[PDB]
Amino acid sequence: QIDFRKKINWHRRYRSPQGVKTEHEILRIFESDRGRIINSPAIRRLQQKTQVFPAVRTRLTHSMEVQQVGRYIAKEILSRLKELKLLEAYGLDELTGPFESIVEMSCLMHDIGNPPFGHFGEAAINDWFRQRLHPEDAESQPLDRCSVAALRLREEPLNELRRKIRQDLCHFEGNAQGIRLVHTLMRMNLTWAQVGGILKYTRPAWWRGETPETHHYLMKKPGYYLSEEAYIARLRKELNLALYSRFPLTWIMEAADDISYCVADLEDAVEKRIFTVEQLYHHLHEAWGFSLVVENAWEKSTEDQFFMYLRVNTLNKLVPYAAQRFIDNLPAIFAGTFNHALLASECSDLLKLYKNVAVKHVFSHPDVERLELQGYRVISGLLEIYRPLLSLSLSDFTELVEKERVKRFPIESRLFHKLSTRHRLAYVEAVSKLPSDSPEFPLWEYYYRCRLLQDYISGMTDLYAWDEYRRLMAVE
Amino acid sequence: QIDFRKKINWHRRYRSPQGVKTEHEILRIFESDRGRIINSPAIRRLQQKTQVFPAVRTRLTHSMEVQQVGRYIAKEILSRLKELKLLEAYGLDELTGPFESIVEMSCLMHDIGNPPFGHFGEAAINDWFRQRLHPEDAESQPLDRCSVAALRLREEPLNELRRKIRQDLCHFEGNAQGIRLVHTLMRMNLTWAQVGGILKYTRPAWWRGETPETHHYLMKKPGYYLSEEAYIARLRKELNLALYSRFPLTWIMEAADDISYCVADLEDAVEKRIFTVEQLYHHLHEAWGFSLVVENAWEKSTEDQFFMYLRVNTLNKLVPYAAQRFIDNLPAIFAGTFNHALLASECSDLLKLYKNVAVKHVFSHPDVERLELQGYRVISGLLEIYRPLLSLSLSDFTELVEKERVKRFPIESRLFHKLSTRHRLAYVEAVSKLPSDSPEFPLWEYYYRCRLLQDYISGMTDLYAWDEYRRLMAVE
Amino acid sequence: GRLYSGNLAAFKAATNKLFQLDLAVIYDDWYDAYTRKDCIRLRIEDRSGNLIDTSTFYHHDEDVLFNMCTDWLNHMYDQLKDWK
Amino acid sequence: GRLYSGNLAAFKAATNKLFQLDLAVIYDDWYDAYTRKDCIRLRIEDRSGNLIDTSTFYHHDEDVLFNMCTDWLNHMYDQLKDWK
Amino acid sequence: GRLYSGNLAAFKAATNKLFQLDLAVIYDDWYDAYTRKDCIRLRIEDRSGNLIDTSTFYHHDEDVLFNMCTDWLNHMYDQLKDWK
Amino acid sequence: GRLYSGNLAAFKAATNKLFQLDLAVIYDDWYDAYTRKDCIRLRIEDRSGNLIDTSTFYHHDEDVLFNMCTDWLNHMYDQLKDWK
Numbered sequence A, B: 001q002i003d004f005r006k007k008i009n010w011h012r013r014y015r016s017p018q019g020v021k022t023e024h025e026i027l028r029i030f031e032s033d034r035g036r037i038i039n040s041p042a043i044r045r046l047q048q049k050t051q052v053f054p055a056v057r058t059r060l061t062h063s064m065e066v067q068q069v070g071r072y073i074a075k076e077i078l079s080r081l082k083e084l085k086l087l088e089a090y091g092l093d094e095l096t097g098p099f100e101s102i103v104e105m106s107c108l109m110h111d112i113g114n115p116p117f118g119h120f121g122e123a124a125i126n127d128w129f130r131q132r133l134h135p136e137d138a139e140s141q142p143l144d145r146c147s148v149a150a151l152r153l154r155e156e157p158l159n160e161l162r163r164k165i166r167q168d169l170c171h172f173e174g175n176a177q178g179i180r181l182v183h184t185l186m187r188m189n190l191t192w193a194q195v196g197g198i199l200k201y202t203r204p205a206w207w208r209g210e211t212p213e214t215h216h217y218l219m220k221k222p223g224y225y226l227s228e229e230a231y232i233a234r235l236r237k238e239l240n241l242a243l244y245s246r247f248p249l250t251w252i253m254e255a256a257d258d259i260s261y262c263v264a265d266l267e268d269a270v271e272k273r274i275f276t277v278e279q280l281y282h283h284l285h286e287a288w289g290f291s292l293v294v295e296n297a298w299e300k301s302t303e304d305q306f307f308m309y310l311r312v313n314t315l316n317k318l319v320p321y322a323a324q325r326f327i328d329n330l331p332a333i334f335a336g337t338f339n340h341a342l343l344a345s346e347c348s349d350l351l352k353l354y355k356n357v358a359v360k361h362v363f364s365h366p367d368v369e370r371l372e373l374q375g376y377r378v379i380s381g382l383l384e385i386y387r388p389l390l391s392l393s394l395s396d397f398t399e400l401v402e403k404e405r406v407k408r409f410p411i412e413s414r415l416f417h418k419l420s421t422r423h424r425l426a427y428v429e430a431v432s433k434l435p436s437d438s439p440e441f442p443l444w445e446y447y448y449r450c451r452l453l454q455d456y457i458s459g460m461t462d463l464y465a466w467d468e469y470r471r472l473m474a475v476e
Numbered sequence C, D, E, F: 001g002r003l004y005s006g007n008l009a010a011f012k013a014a015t016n017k018l019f020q021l022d023l024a025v026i027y028d029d030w031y032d033a034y035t036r037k038d039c040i041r042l043r044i045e046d047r048s049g050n051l052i053d054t055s056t057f058y059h060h061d062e063d064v065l066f067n068m069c070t071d072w073l074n075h076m077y078d079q080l081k082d083w084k
């Protein structure tokens, strides 16, 4: 039995609104969330992060186009169900408002957790830790190249935590950082339904081994960290989701990102004089092998008149297919066990046309390739500068965080004051709860210290990280 | 009789959709407009224009907050009318969708026509022309300090056009430039209802004299240029608006901008370490003379937790007042003759609290004041560089625009190729229609040349104009 | 919110136009106690210091207030050039 | 869309783990004609060049394909260290 | 290869010298079909639009062509100031 | 006024020298109420947590206080390596 009232949850974690609410006040709850998200520092920082080129689109302008495509898929789904007189049977009679708002806010904050420089900024964090923790040596019985005495295998009940911590710390993902940023750092206090829309994958970050064949697609990438294990269980209990299951509305957000994947970059390439509009049209004609979508736009223009109709032509052919795919496989999506994506036909083959042209003529440009190598060097250097913070002992770091005026560590104390206050407050709150008289305190303390170090690096704009790296090396 | 079906027009100017449409396909028309506006080059350029400070808000981030406030005023108005069972009587039974979309798109593109450097960039254009055209000498019978032979008073039927052209060219306004940019330059081809939402004022740019006392507020600033006189008449005929009248939905957009006027700048000041959160709270307490709005937020936090609740507290007190004011004075707003704004009570006095603190502690900062003087110098210098283009004759400029390879004007031809292609195409289309064998051709040609020069300057980002000014002066 | 450039230019043009008749204008501006609207007072007098007339305008908007001041100055100029 | 760093790291770790038993792995990758999915072929052989076994995996997603390759390599290592 | 600055300056000086007698000059320039030389046509007429005379000059060099145009303009000015 | 680098280096060297005998040192520092001099307390104990002895030193100068702490640590090391 499909019932969307058991999925759309308007409760919160702190100061949750209790009691019965009418249809009007329920809508007011989902508008304050919109006000919180739009006026948040995390969204403002998106305009200083680059998509491909450093009139070019940024991540803020890119996420605004994904938000428009999501609205349109939700509206098509809602209108198609009313024709079949299934809106009342599915529980969506008094929930058409929040249904689109949740999709729109999930599409907006789908890239808030990406580190500076993007993909190559994500790899640099992973390799640097991989050399200090050596996760591959903790898979089996004690062998050990670990550089930390407390995390070296030596004690069956304590080795499982050691290997979990060692595996988790070498798996940094932007989607997993998005949940942590929205709950622990920013403290936005969003509704349960809103948080579930940004849970793209369900594989834990500490997972080592083979995933079940029933969920081999939903667990292809890490979804959340170990420090959020208690928060994810409460979310699953609140939204009635089984283990390793997905929220129904996450599928619509995934399809919106796939539509707006390369089309914007092709337009941005023309504005940088990589090629001309006629050259791009010839390249598309050669790669295709189009008439209804591309040819209609070509004869209707010349630069700001070719893409403006191509986007409409491809939307009018892709959105109904996505709506029909969502509607057809409804029980599996509602259960959360659908192991496929909405988008092997003429529709999916069309996206590969834009995919192949972009990787060959835009992503291979020398200027794009150079920035990828420079970004990898910047992140590696920043982690080496803060390495003395990770080499201290528990007592020394406790004295540093408590006294703030230490006469024994002049270099280490000055590096400590450069960290943002929110990250330090999060660290203090996290370590202010573990049992002090336990044989697990050093391990958790080291894990939280590493997480605190990782939060500071990933919360920077590309431009700020470069400036800080150049200044800390006595170059600028 | 109030009937919103005669105001919400879904027709276009070119390839207009004809025939009867149902409620579903009508909504599809207002979504393509949203796709066009969001994916337009004019909106992308808003992220490179500064609001006050060059994590700070830009014009794109500012217009996104105004869009959220507008949504919320429209939703409150729509919900309040359903309680009185007036939705069907007013014709809004099948138009609740486009009603909010029009307001949301009008709030989004409410600053697309502002010149670089803003207010002081607007003055610099006006003074430079005022020295070349001397509009005050054409008010009465022939006297003449005009620097153009064709625009000097000498011929009763031809002097009226001369004085109209001389007065219009010295009145550059961003709102008047918004209509021209959306129709003639970008060629977006929006619906009539969407264009009417960005017509803030109704005074013609060539108006000289005293305005009627019945419209002394709606005609306080210029609204449109002389080159759009034919387009505005068609718009008035399409939307059933009398002379010097306003569109009903424009009032909601005006109230949204007034709410989000200084609150963001106060938050941006703290992020630049002008003062601290406690200092700002003390300043607000001293200036106020608050408990329900500011005190509630102060005790609920500390930087990203004070404004997040202050905004909610002021919205929950300001939005219902605006909705009630809109509903009470409905016949006058529908007729378009309401000579007041929605926002003399405890509500209007609260905005002055934020107004007075911002002008004394933020707008008076030395760094803000310096950028205002530098911007005035940059725009004046750019107009002097292109002055030789305005000194040519009709035949020479015709040869320049036709041949493009002139051996008699080496300096003038090279300056001509720096202008954008869209502005040149607009000029060609405009002059390709006037009767050649008429005694009015030189005057119209000079007016269109001046408009072409003004379009190029106002379509720049602050950062691009500075770089071009420094490069053209052989400094960089 | 801020005063438009064209209104200030028109006000200055009217001031100079009336100054061309060897006259002068004094300008005063303040905020009223409870009416919640700005007030501007103008006085017209010749060079010798003999006051001719004065006026005061109250409004909460800068644009309307300046337009009223400009049109009052224009009416004064018109009346003073009808005779003398 | 692009391959995740962790999957590549795990694939390399499995390759080195099986290389620690004086073995070698050859890698081939291509795109199929009509199945619309990428194909990767692996061959395991010792240093002398005696081929032991081969496998081919087809999938349209990079992450799943690499995970399947990694787990097949791990199973090969497990089976080859059960005896010999 | 390109036109020299002095020739253009002399051409403009002659144009202004003849313009000082309330006259005007129209300028046309093109490339001929098979003669392989550029052509420039000049027309002299007064302000009222009454055409006086025209001339056309053909040459493959810019410098010589402009000098011929300048000296023809000077001869026109001389003849038109001999009388009237 | 500030602590000299050499004194801190000697203090750390003594701490490591005594740490080479599988021992540990806890450090506490504060300011006294009315004596107007900083106080530093040291405690020496083994890894199992059995406290051996403690000491407290008071002085208004950092250099002298750190030298006293260092020489007390050296005496502790000497006494603890005389036997055991």
Ligand SMILES: Nc1nc2c(ncn2[C@@H]2O[C@H](COP(=O)(O)OP(=O)(O)OP(=O)(O)O)[C@@H](O)[C@H]2O)c(=O)[nH]1
Binding pocket: A051, A052, A119, A175, A221, A257, A260, A261, A262, A265, A359, A363, A368, D001, D002
């Ligand atoms: N420089 C560069 N940018 C790329 C490339 N492929 C995609 N992009 C850009 O990155 C965007 C998508 O990021 P991807 O790394 O492909 O993956 P993703 O969507 O972030 O991944 P998930 O979170 O797993 O869904 C595209 O819209 C492009 O703007 C590439 O090869 N090189």
Ligand SMILES: Nc1nc2c(ncn2[C@@H]2O[C@H](COP(=O)(O)OP(=O)(O)OP(=O)(O)O)[C@@H](O)[C@H]2O)c(=O)[nH]1
Binding pocket: B051, B052, B119, B175, B221, B257, B260, B261, B262, B265, B359, B363, B368, C001, C002
């Ligand atoms: N530097 C500076 N910025 C200001 C000042 N007053 C307002 N602003 C900024 O400009 C915004 C509003 O612009 P205004 O020039 O006041 O007027 P406006 O809203 O553009 O005007 P209209 O189009 O006539 O409604 C405010 O939200 C501030 O961000 C000021 O005195 N100095």
Ligand SMILES: Nc1nc2c(ncn2[C@@H]2O[C@H](COP(=O)(O)OP(=O)(O)OP(=O)(O)O)[C@@H](O)[C@H]2O)c(=O)[nH]1
Binding pocket: E001, E002
């Ligand atoms: N930027 C630019 N360079 C040119 C142009 N025409 C020619 N050149 C360059 O200048 C060289 C010849 O100079 P010109 O000015 O054409 O004439 P010239 O040979 O110096 O002239 P003489 O001394 O009279 O023979 C060519 O070989 C080109 O390198 C042009 O239109 N623009």
Ligand SMILES: Nc1nc2c(ncn2[C@@H]2O[C@H](COP(=O)(O)OP(=O)(O)OP(=O)(O)O)[C@@H](O)[C@H]2O)c(=O)[nH]1
Binding pocket: F001, F002
């Ligand atoms: N940046 C910084 N400067 C300091 C500090 N303390 C003192 N100073 C400056 O350095 C001056 C004194 O230097 P100190 O290092 O304190 O010592 P000193 O007087 O040079 O030392 P002696 O030669 O042993 O007497 C003061 O007058 C300050 O100008 C501090 O903590 N930080």
Ligand SMILES: [Mg+2]
Binding pocket: A066, A110, A111, A257
């Ligand atoms: Mg995306």
Ligand SMILES: [Mg+2]
Binding pocket: B066, B110, B111, B257
């Ligand atoms: Mg605004």
